Swiss-Prot record:
Compartment annotation: Cytoplasm; Nucleus; Cell membrane; Membrane, Clathrin-coated pit
Statement: the UniProt record of this protein carries the keyword Electron transport: no
Swiss-Prot/TrEMBL keywords: Cell membrane, Cell projection, Coated pit, Cytoplasm, Cytoplasmic vesicle, Membrane, Nucleus, Phosphoprotein, Protein transport, Signal transduction inhibitor, Transcription, Transcription regulation, Transport, Ubl conjugation
Self-association and partners: Monomer. Homodimer. Homooligomer; the self-association is mediated by InsP6-binding. Heterooligomer with ARRB2; the association is mediated by InsP6-binding. Interacts with ADRB2 (phosphorylated). Interacts with CHRM2 (phosphorylated). Interacts with LHCGR. Interacts with CYTH2 and CASR. Interacts with AP2B1 (dephosphorylated at 'Tyr-737'); phosphorylation of AP2B1 at 'Tyr-737' disrupts the interaction. Interacts with CCR2 and GRK2. Interacts with CRR5. Interacts with PTAFR (phosphorylated on serine residues). Interacts with CLTC and MAP2K3.
Protein name: Beta-arrestin-1
PTM note: At the plasma membrane, is rapidly dephosphorylated, a process that is required for clathrin binding and ADRB2 endocytosis but not for ADRB2 binding and desensitization. Once internalized, is rephosphorylated.
Region Interaction with SRC, annotated ranges: 1-160
Region (Interaction with CHRM2): 42-83
Gene Ontology biological process terms from the UniProt entry: clathrin-dependent endocytosis; desensitization of G protein-coupled receptor signaling pathway; G protein-coupled receptor internalization; negative regulation of Notch signaling pathway; positive regulation of ERK1 and ERK2 cascade; positive regulation of protein phosphorylation; positive regulation of receptor internalization; protein transport
Result when mutating K245Q: Impairs InsP6-binding and oligomerization
The keyword RNA-binding belongs to this UniProt entry's keyword annotation: no
Length: 356
């Protein structure tokens, strides 16, 4: 029942950024525009220019550090805009939010708008664990307002103000996700036929996944139990190539399958970051400390797209496994997307959260 807008001022107070929201939805076909305003103090500002830089960049190294010669970085995308003087230009028409934000402020709140390309990677992070914190890495979208005579002139952290916006992926549902099968001979004439499938291709966070297990046991062997499990896969495509893998869900059913007998059952489990705080190597869609953080959404491949510049490729697979009294198994691919969200101005500090 209101219209909130986040904000964050520079260490001093001269510069102050305002934004409608932290996250920004990437509809694959197009990313939402970055609406914002920057309140400049004409006093110390002098005649020099006020810039605003949006920057997507792959980081690698200690989480905290950022010093050159230690922390690696690579700008996957950069966009500079001159908020003062207002430049020509114009050109992007002011949004309803930018207008009302200027009204509340006073003849020193200058608009700025970034249009993010579709092929860019979403926000993502990967904690290697305490064993080797230096292996940390991820993609990050920064927003940085500052003031200087030119884009070349070095900045000063007291002047500038750094925000960190996330770009979240999304895509509506809608054919039946193909099944997966495997015949295996266990010291027998006839094969044990394992088969499984899913009710959906695209799952959202917190949503339960239903696995349709169906097993024609044509052997004289007995299946003692069945392990269902969701598995994350994360490939590091920059600075230091590697492939992580980690179970985000597990369920061991002591369900048996008699020889020559058929079996069927729909299992259900839900991948959840809650059980992952003690996990090593795991792709998150944000910082581990924030509450609004979740498991990294699945990375969309664009057929001819360059997967190297994507920084980190995340993917997911359900895995059925029959523990024979050898072990038969299968793996079902599936997409994990971010849930769709489905008045007077009210300010709020840009800080995420950590509680508790
Ligand atoms: Ba096959
Ligand atoms: Ba259950």
């Amino acid at each position: 029942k209101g219209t909130r807008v986040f904000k964050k001022a520079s260490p001093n107070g001269k510069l102050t950024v305002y934004l409608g929201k932290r996250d920004f939805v990437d509809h694959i076909d197009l990313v939402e525009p970055v609406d914002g305003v920057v309140l400049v103090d004409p006093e110390y500002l002098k005649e020099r220019r006020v810039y605003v830089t949006l920057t997507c960049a792959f980081r690698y190294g200690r989480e905290d550090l950022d010093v050159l010669g230690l922390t690696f970085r690579k700008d996957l995308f950069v966009a500079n805009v001159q908020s003062f003087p207002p430049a020509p230009e114009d050109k992007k028409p002011l949004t309803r939010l930018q207008e009302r934000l200027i009204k509340k402020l006073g003849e020193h709140a200058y608009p700025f708008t970034f249009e993010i390309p579709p092929n860019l990677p979403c926000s993502v992070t990967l904690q290697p664990g305490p064993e080797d914190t230096g292996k940390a890495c991820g993609v990050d979208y920064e927003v940085k307002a500052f003031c200087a005579e030119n884009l070349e002139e070095k900045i000063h952290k007291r002047n500038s103000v750094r925000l960190v916006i996330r770009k979240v992926q999304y895509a509506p549902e809608r054919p039946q996700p193909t099944a997966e099968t495997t015949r295996q001979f266990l010291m027998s004439d006839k094969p044990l036929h394992l088969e499984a499938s899913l009710d959906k291709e695209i799952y959202y966070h917190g949503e339960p996944i239903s696995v349709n297990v169906h097993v024609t046991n044509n052997t004289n062997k007995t299946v003692k139990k069945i392990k269902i499990s969701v598995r994350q896969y994360a490939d590091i495509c920059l600075f230091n190539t590697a492939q992580y893998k980690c179970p985000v869900a597990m369920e061991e059913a002591d369900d048996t399958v008699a020889p020559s007998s058929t079996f069927c059952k729909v299992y259900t489990l839900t991948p959840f970051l809650a059980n992952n705080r003690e996990k090593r190597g795991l792709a998150l869609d944000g910082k581990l400390k924030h509450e609004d953080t979740n498991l990294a959404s699945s990375t969309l491949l664009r057929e001819g797209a360059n997967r190297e510049i994507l920084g980190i490729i995340v993917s997911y697979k359900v895995k059925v496994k029959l523990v024979v009294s050898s072990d038969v198994a299968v793996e079902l691919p599936f997409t994990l997307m971010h849930p769709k969200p489905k008045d007077d101005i009210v300010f709020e500090d840009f800080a995420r959260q950590r509680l508790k």
